[model samples]
Target: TPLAILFMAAVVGTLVGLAAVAFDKGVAWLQNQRMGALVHTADNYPLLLTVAFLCSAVLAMFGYFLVRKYAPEAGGSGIPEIEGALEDQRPVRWWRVLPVKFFGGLGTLGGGMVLGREGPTVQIGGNIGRMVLDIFRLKGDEARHTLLATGAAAGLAAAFNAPLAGILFIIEEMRPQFRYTLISIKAVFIGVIMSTIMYRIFNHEVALIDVGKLSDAPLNTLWLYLILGIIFGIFGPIFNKWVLGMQDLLHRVHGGNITKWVLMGGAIGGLCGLLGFVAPATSGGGFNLIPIATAGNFSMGMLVFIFVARVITTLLCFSSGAPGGIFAPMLALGTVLGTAFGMVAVELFPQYHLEAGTFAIAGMGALLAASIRAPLTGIILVLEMTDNYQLILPMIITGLGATLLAQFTGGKPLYSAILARTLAKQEAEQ
Candidate 1:
């Protein structure tokens, strides 16, 4: 091709890598500042409530106002928009989305919202790809589309510090949108490599979750993880349905009124703040909760209770259209449930020689596989986050089982469905 996509992809990758590093560092600093703020507010319950409620409400409103008024396309996950862009069916309003998502996401997510930054990060990266295209004055459709994919891969790599997973996410999840060209594939690779380097430089080479590696699951005990996957498969679709249902409900309750929406968000955010004081594991984005919940900290009942509380909070925070990703919190839920299940199994079947954390690791990917239906992305993300290569087999088995079962149960990938809905709404409005 005359476009020489690979060379341009390398340049795109360099830009994406720098952006990802900067994004990561900025978020990390925000996290520390938030933590410090929380510490100060911990003793004064009313003060804590006021702080979380006002912060989350204002932040969520900011995101909602931006999406409703300025850029409706940026609402929800941007993955679908990227997909639409690739198909030439969607317009990339990058100029509007880049700043809106970045700042809106920072505010909403900075509060104790059950949101993950990864989804927005990927979307931002794709926009960056488009932005570069505009800057370089790329004239062709192919050039613009190619760099969009490259930026997306770089974004995921930078967000999670998982270079290979970034490439695989585009390959596996965006299979339909992607052109599958040799040049495009190479662009994806280059972007991932640069993004990974940038992420490591900023954050150092440590797993996002520092749970020490658990003993590998033996072949004989592998079946237990399968059972866990099957369980998540059943729950995953239900969870997705609940998410959609809750969104509809929240919309109805708010009736497009900004005041009620912000107040509702404040209620949820304050409740989360209180939960954080009482049971730290039940709050936040479920990122910090994963290690603690999986490390055998809670009694089985506490684990189940926290899981239930988290599910409710997660649905509220995420489905309410707050500026966050449901990915991390859902994974945390899967881990909590899987750990509890493994412990129970061990109690009942001593002969199986089951390890709870092994199931914890396995469950980490299972729900993502089931809900998102991106088994490869889910598996690779977990493996990279945990750095437990030994658990790959179990993780694969668990993820595959979860995905297959979810498919059989009529579950669709979360982001795709969200994107489809957004597109439908756009068409309807037009």
Candidate 2:
């Protein structure tokens, strides 16, 4: 049974890798199809605007239809559902979720919403695990739990090609539901390793978010990271409230009506389409903008403007029940804000010779740390995705500070907060 479980983990991992790659590539292809057409017809402003609105509206409607009609739980980030499932409070309806998430996610992202793929991918991964376990008739709840986590880790690893972060994510973020037994850890590691291998096989080895090689942070400059962390700590709780409040606002507006929900999605998606065309930095998942921001292409005022603009867009896209994660958007925000502060520091103390990229990288995970309350995963996630292994101390300091401040301010972990609300909503229905 043990060996069977171990070998089956590889199957789940590889399948997750395949699924994540397909989802990632499909989203990219659709974006390119729409954006590429926009570029070719840039000379005609009216046609460009029409195409942007119509195409994005259609895409969003398509995704919302799937989620609303077929799988309501598939909307939102989806991590909470997986979390609840692990605790046996929720069920993993793999049959519905697998298709809904895969196709549904493609549409929302393709429509240019500010959603992350990691959340959907992680949910997809966990569902695939559940699928395989049922297919092979895996016995015992312990085996079931182990493979579910293994698949989740595998999905994350595939999503970003960060095996270590993938492993750390399940261990840290899913701490309550995830079992720390030896077999489970082994399966999780194996799943991550296999999933990463499959990811490389499809896309080759590349850092998911390359900000270039940044300089080593100076000892004197270390304090800056904490300050950044502190700033993120304050903003983190507010951001969580914004996300939750927006979700509540949408629920109130939609009143559980599918038509209104889909139409609202179209409106937001259309707006996102326009923003992507007019102000590219403020729209989409914000991954592409990360390197650009960290490379110091924008002025301080411009960075702040983009940051504020994205905050609104991010809230709209995610709160509208789009099938995406907050990870990439949060990371992008960190880059802009951190670099903005770093740019100011450079002007203030020219003697420091500070590189904004250092702060950019440090700030990358601070928001995630605070919002998710998973500092370990956030730190290593930024490190793995960006290949900035040298700045561990700064990253650690920043993430710890952010998480501590967030806790003191009564901020709950992002996914758990969402889960609690889901439970509350269900209770209301009952």
Candidate 3:
């Protein structure tokens, strides 16, 4: 069966590449269609308002329904689900999750809800790995675990066109549950390479976040990144607490009623639709906002305003239990604040030349480090996302500082805490 195994592995790599490309294109098309619809209807005042509200409401409600009704474990970021799956403590339910997450994600995201595609894309990719394994009649747990990780990496690489980042993400972030091996790593590498190639074929090779080759952080300026990390360390715990608190609040408000869940989702989605016009920065996943926030355009005050508004929107949108992720919005918030910090540092101490965008890059990972408790993953993921190889040292310092400080302050990894709660709830229900 060595030949059979080899054949299946090749199939896994090839078909996963194709599937990822297809999914990537589907998401792009839906997003464009949604934007086109919004733009076409924008001229009408009252009619546009109603349309916006209805669009978001329906999309949000649909996402909520899919999560609550069919794939409860598919809720939130779904990263924890992958971890749980690796440990065999969680169910894959790919038959349900793949479709729900893909379509449900398109709805919530296309409707302008504050969510990231990365989480669902990664989840679906992981499921795809499992699906391929089952199809090949692979029986061993080792094969299941390793191939699932492979698929997840492939998914991220395809999503962002960052292959190395996906591999590093597995090695670093999933270290707690990942069963490392040379073969497994190679499988991950193959998956990522294929996925990245596919993504490039479909979407081109531009880096996901183009901060445009910023100046390096001098040793003198290094301390400022540490300060930013420290600041994030403080906010990160508060953010995590708020996320948990908001979830609890929403659960109580809904009292396990589906109507309340759907209605609340609709209200938030509708508000996001309106906010898309009023405060464009406050809505959508953080892709478009990252460049604007990091380009040194917004004043400190405006940056703070957007930061707070985004916090509210992110917390509401994510905490409402709609199928989405808080990662991009969190990163967007970090970039705004980090660039602001770098700006202040430049104004006060011009001797040490600085690039606010460097802080923007550092901040992307720093906040993630603090919140997710995965400093290495945050560092490498940012490096891969931005392709700013020169800034890796600063990123490490910032990420480490954030991790230590957040740990000292008792901040837990966001998804781990979420999964723990889900596990406890399952036990109680049992």
How many pairs of residues collide in each model?
0, 1, 0
Residues 178-253, candidate 1, lDDT per residue (tens digit)? Answer: 3566776777787778777766766676788888767877778878778888898898888778877888897788
* Model 2 global lDDT (CA atoms, 0 to 1): 0.85
Deviation of model 1 at 94, angstroms: 2.0
- Misplaced by over 4 Å in model 2 are 174-179
lDDT of 2 at 364: 86
**Global local distance difference test of model 1:** 0.75
- After TM-score superposition, the amount by which residue 302's alpha carbon in candidate 1 deviates from its true location, in angstroms, is 0.8
Candidate maximizing TM-score: 2
- Per-candidate TM-score against the hidden true structure: 0.92, 0.97, 0.93
Tens digits of per-residue lDDT, candidate 3, 1-430, equal: 4345444555555666677667556656766776688788667678877876787788778888777887777777868788778777877867888788877876777678887777777787888888888976779867777778878777777776667667766766655553466676666676777667766776665767886677777787788878888898888888888999999998897888877777878888889878886678888878878988776888887887888888888888887776666667777878887888878877888787776778788899888888877676677777777777898778888888888888788877887888888888878985
lDDT string, candidate 2, 112-158, tens digits: 88888798999999999999989997788788888888887887899
Checking candidate 2 for backbone clashes, the offending pairs are 116-325
**TM-score winner, 1 or 2:** 2
Residue 370, model 2, lDDT? 84
Give the alpha-carbon lDDT of every model.
Answer: 0.75, 0.85, 0.77
- Give the 10-residue window scoring lowest on summed lDDT in candidate 2: 171-180
Specify the highest-lDDT model's number.
2
